[PDB]
């Protein structure tokens, strides 16, 4: 950032005012800027139409909108408020795309089961009326003082209702509604959030939404500057029209405040009156705060006093760190780096973290499955392998992405897109690890043919000099007819695949997984072959699984199949048990 202020001072050709100073401290900070990932990201194969969340076409009529955000720092400080707020925000990003939130998917990484994080998530999720269809729980002391909370949200939006995260023409107005702005971020509540969801969609139907963006880091500042910058336009932000929680706030406060449950809507001036009516009706606070213009300047006004004015683009774009070319080495073999294997059934139940109460199949089997209609549905998988990543960064990440495809295929789904969250340590002290990650993901996608639809990033995850295990959490989207999805029943258990790994024959395993899934077999793809959750959920059906699991370690290419007949495929197949009663 030091580098960054003399750059700012260079561009501004003067010392920044107190406000500018504040305004850039946020827009240019890693979180909002992505100065270390912009380049590495642009490299990744994209798809759909990403705004505040990637939107993937699911059947030419409907599209699923999803994204996976992190809440690592705010969760480290406060677990409950940390988690719940992460849930609040990511859901808004999905909301801002015109899709109705339909699932919340977990990805916790901790030194122990922090009840604060699990409840903050469950509570908020329940209070907005959005199920937590699935999740992923990784336990390790390596995450002792740096809990990783990766929350993924998803929703459905008709393709003829997709909402853009940008301003299109000089003359539109930007509306800010939802919670009232107050000195937050120099405590969110789902009731409001719920009204925001029910209120936003409402407006969307009436064609009253021509552009939108959630309010997160940066408050009124980020949402307006980015709404106009994305469309090479400008804005005349009138801070006195922002509804305030605490009325005695200074311009710079209102502007940069980070109050929760707030949205920004870009629309036609003639539509605002209605936006504010649907907004007030749902007990929210709205008003026409900003106005999009042609001169690419970001002019912030209070009443008649000029608070600030800068080249909108200078704000939108942050200095870009260079990139480092990582050249994959030979694949090394990993050793049992273990993640404690902790059982939190009755904990998830105590806090109502039901995880899968309305899916085609209990998310305890990995890939969640949601219906869109009788014969139309999508799949959600969240994977990650820091145990391998720790050891080797490139190959451990590449593998998490491959293992995700399996999970996706073990439910009968076609992989469509990937959303990922980058949980890394310090990029400056060790910029190679980061590149080893991004490259691993760049390659894995080019290998599987699955494109990145959206993503997130959390860097500088360190505890007094120590960086967290390189952790890229993979969020894959699958397509799938629910009717064809396989449900568990009494059958024999098989071990299909190799106890080891080989990048080439990954696709042969994908091939076998498909042949079998389609023949109606029920498959399981987890690095441990079988776990607590699996066993337990089989009981849900009144099934007792009895198998003699071979030994993989610690990155194999084998799944478990449960069918009547023996699997006839062009890959190792060995019978190993039952599943009855």
Ligand X SMILES: Nc1ncnc2c1ncn2[C@@H]1O[C@H](COP(=O)(O)OP(=O)(O)O)[C@@H](O)[C@H]1O
Q: Which of residues 168-227 bind ligand X (CB under 6 A)?
A: 216
Q: Which residues contact 463 (CB under 8 A, 6 or more apart)?
A: 144, 145, 146
User: Of the ranges 44-52, 246-254, 386-394, 520-528, which one interacts with ligand X (CB under 6 A)?
Assistant: 44-52
Q: Is 216 near Mg ion (CB under 5 A)?
A: yes
Q: With CB under 5 A as the contact rule, which of the stretches 85-93, 347-355, 427-435, 501-509 interacts with Mg ion?
A: 85-93
Q: What is the dihedral of CA 505, 511, 516, 517, to 10 degrees?
A: 120
Q: How far is the CB of 85 from Mg ion (least distance, A)?
A: 11
Q: Which of 5, 21, 41, 324 binds ligand X (CB under 6 A)?
A: 41
- Cβ at position 223, least distance to ligand X in Å: 9
Helix (H) or strand (E) holding 110: strand 108-110
User: What is the nearest approach in angstroms of Mg ion to the Cβ of residue 413?
Assistant: 27
The pair of three-digit structure tokens given for residue 211, joined into one six-digit string: 């552009």
Instruction: State the binding string over 91-120 for ligand X (x if CB under 6 A, else -).
Output: --x---------------------------
Write b or e for each residue in 433-470: b if 16 or more Cβ atoms lie within 10 A of its Cβ, otherwise e. bbbbbbbbbbbbbeebebbbbbbbbbbbbeeeeebbbb
Q: Which of residues 216-235 bind ligand X (CB under 6 A)?
A: 216
- Tell which positions 452-471 bind ligand X, by CB under 6 A: 452, 454-457
48 binds, among ligand X, Mg ion, none (CB under 5 to 8 A by kind): none
Minimum CB distance to Mg ion, residue 157 (Å): 16
Least separation in angstroms between CB 418 and ligand X: 8
Tokens found for residue 285:
């606070």
Per-residue contact track with Mg ion, 36 to 75, x per CB under 5 A? ----------------x-----------------------
Q: Which does 491 bind (CB under 5 to 8 A by kind): ligand X, Mg ion, none?
A: none
In the list ligand X, Mg ion, none, the entry touching 253 (Cβ below 5 to 8 angstroms by class) is: none
Burial class (CB in 10 A: 0-12, 13-18, 19+), 489: middle
Quick one: which segment of 33-41, 297-305, 313-321, 521-529 binds ligand X (CB under 6 A)?
A: 33-41
Tokens at 352, concatenated: 């109502």
Q: Is 422 in the site for ligand X (CB under 6 A)?
A: yes
Task: Assess 153 for contact with ligand X (CB under 6 A).
Answer: no
How far is 186 from 129, CA to CA, in rounded Å?
30
Residues in contact with 17: Cβ distance below 8 Å, sequence separation at least 6, in sequence order:
308
For 535, the enclosing helix (H) or strand (E) is helix 532-539
Min CB(218)–ligand X separation in Å: 8
Q: Look at residue 12 and give its three-state secondary structure.
A: helix
Contact 134, 380 (CB under 8 A): yes
146 lies in the binding site for ligand X (CB under 6 A): no
Q: Decide if residue 448 touches Mg ion (CB under 5 A).
A: no
The site that binds ligand X (CB under 6 A) totals a number of residues, namely 16
Residue 523 CB, shortest distance to ligand X, in Å, is 28
One character per residue 88-127, x = contact with Mg ion (rule: CB under 5 A): -----x----------------------------------
Q: Which CB sits closer to ligand X, 69 or 136?
A: 69
Nearer residue to ligand X within complex by CB, 50 or 321: 50
Q: Which residue is nearest to ligand X (CB)?
A: 455
Long-range contacts at 562-565 (CB < 8 A, ≥ 24 apart): 562/488, 562/489, 562/491, 562/492, 562/493, 562/494, 562/521, 562/522, 562/523, 562/524, 563/491, 563/492, 563/494, 563/516, 563/519, 563/520, 563/521, 563/522, 564/491, 564/492
Q: Which of ligand X, Mg ion, none has residue 85 at its interface (CB below 5 to 8 Å by kind)?
A: none
Question: Could you write out the DSSP letters of every residue in 360-429?
Answer: SS-GGGSSEEEEEETTEEEEEEEE--HHHHHH-HHHHHHHHHHHHHHHHHTTTPEEEEEEEEEE-S-TTT
State the DSSP code for 469.
P
Please state whether 507 falls in left (phi above 0), alpha (psi between -120 and 50) or beta.
alpha
Minimum distance, C-beta of residue 53 to Mg ion, in the bound complex (Å): 8
User: Could you list the residues that contact Mg ion (CB under 5 A)?
Assistant: 52, 93, 214, 216
User: Could you list the residues that contact ligand X (CB under 6 A)?
Assistant: 34, 37, 41, 44, 50, 52, 69, 93, 216, 420, 422, 452, 454-457
């Amino acid at each position: 950032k030091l580098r960054y202020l003399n750059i700012l001072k260079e561009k501004l050709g003067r010392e920044p005012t107190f406000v500018e100073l504040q305004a850039f401290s946020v827009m240019w900070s890693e979180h909002c800027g992505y100065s270390h990932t912009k380049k590495y990201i642009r490299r990744l194969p994209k798809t759909g139409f990403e705004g505040n969340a990637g939107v993937v076409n699911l059947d030419d009529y409907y599209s699923v909108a999803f994204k996976i955000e992190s809440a690592n720092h705010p969760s480290a400080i406060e677990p409950y408020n940390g988690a719940a707020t992460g849930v609040g925000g990511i859901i808004r990003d999905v909301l801002a795309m015109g899709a109705r939130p339909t699932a919340i998917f977990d990805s916790l990484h901790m030194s122990r089961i922090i009840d604060g994080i699990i409840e903050g998530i469950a509570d908020y999720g329940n209070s907005i009326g959005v199920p937590t269809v699935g999740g992923e729980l990784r336990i390790s002391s390596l995450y002792a003082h740096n809990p990783l909370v990766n929350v993924l949200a998803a929703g459905v939006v008709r393709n003829d209702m997709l909402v853009d995260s940008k301003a299109s023409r000089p003359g539109q107005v930007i509306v800010i509604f939802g919670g009232a702005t107050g000195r937050d971020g120099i405590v969110g509540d789902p009731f409001a959030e719920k009204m925001l969801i029910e209120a936003f969609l409402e407006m969307v139907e009436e064609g009253l939404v021509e552009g939108a963006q959630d309010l997160g880091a940066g408050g009124v500042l980020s949402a307006t500057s980015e709404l106009v910058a994305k469309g090479n336009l400008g804005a005349i932000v009138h801070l006195d029209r922002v509804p305030l929680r605490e009325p005695d706030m200074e311009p710079w406060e209102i502007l940069i405040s980070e109050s929760q449950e707030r949205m920004a809507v870009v629309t036609s001036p003639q539509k605002a009156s209605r936006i504010l009516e649907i907004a007030r009706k749902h007990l929210l606070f709205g008003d026409v705060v900003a106005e999009v213009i042609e001169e690419p300047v970001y002019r912030v006004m209070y009443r008649n006093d000029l608070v600030m004015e800068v080249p909108v683009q200078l704000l939108a774009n942050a200095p870009e760190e260079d990139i480092v070319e990582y050249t994959p080495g030979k694949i090394p073999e990993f050793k049992r780096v273990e993640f404690e294997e902790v059982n939190a059934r009755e904990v998830f139940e105590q806090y109502d973290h039901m995880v899968g109460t309305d899916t085609v199949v209990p998310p305890g089997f990995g890939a969640a499955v949601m219906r869109i209609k009788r014969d139309g549905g999508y799949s959600l998988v969240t994977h990650s392998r820091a145990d391998l990543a720790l050891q080797d960064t490139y190959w451990g990440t590449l593998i998490a992405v491959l293992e995700s495809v399996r999970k996706t295929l073990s439910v009968g789904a076609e992989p469509l897109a990937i959303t990922n969250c980058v949980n890394y340590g310090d990029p400056d002290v060790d910029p190679v690890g980061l590149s080893a990650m991004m490259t691993a993901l760049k390659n894995a996608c080019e290998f599987s043919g699955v494109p990145v639809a959206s993503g997130n990033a959390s860097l500088y995850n360190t505890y007094q000099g120590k960086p967290i295990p390189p952790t890229l959490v993979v969020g894959m989207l699958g397509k799938v007819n629910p009717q064809k999805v396989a449900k568990p029943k009494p059958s024999k258990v098989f071990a299909v695949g190799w106890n080891d790994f080989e990048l080439e024959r990954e696709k042969e395993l994908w091939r076998a997984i498909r042949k079998l899934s389609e023949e109606g077999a029920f498959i399981l793809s987890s690095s441990q072959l079988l776990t607590r959750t699996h066993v337990e959920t089989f009981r849900e059906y009144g099934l007792k699984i009895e198998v003699k699991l071979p030994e993989v370690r610690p990155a194999h290419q084998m799944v478990l199949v449960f069918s009547e007949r023996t699997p006839v495929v062009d890959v190792p197949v060995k019978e190993i048990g039952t599943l009855s009663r």
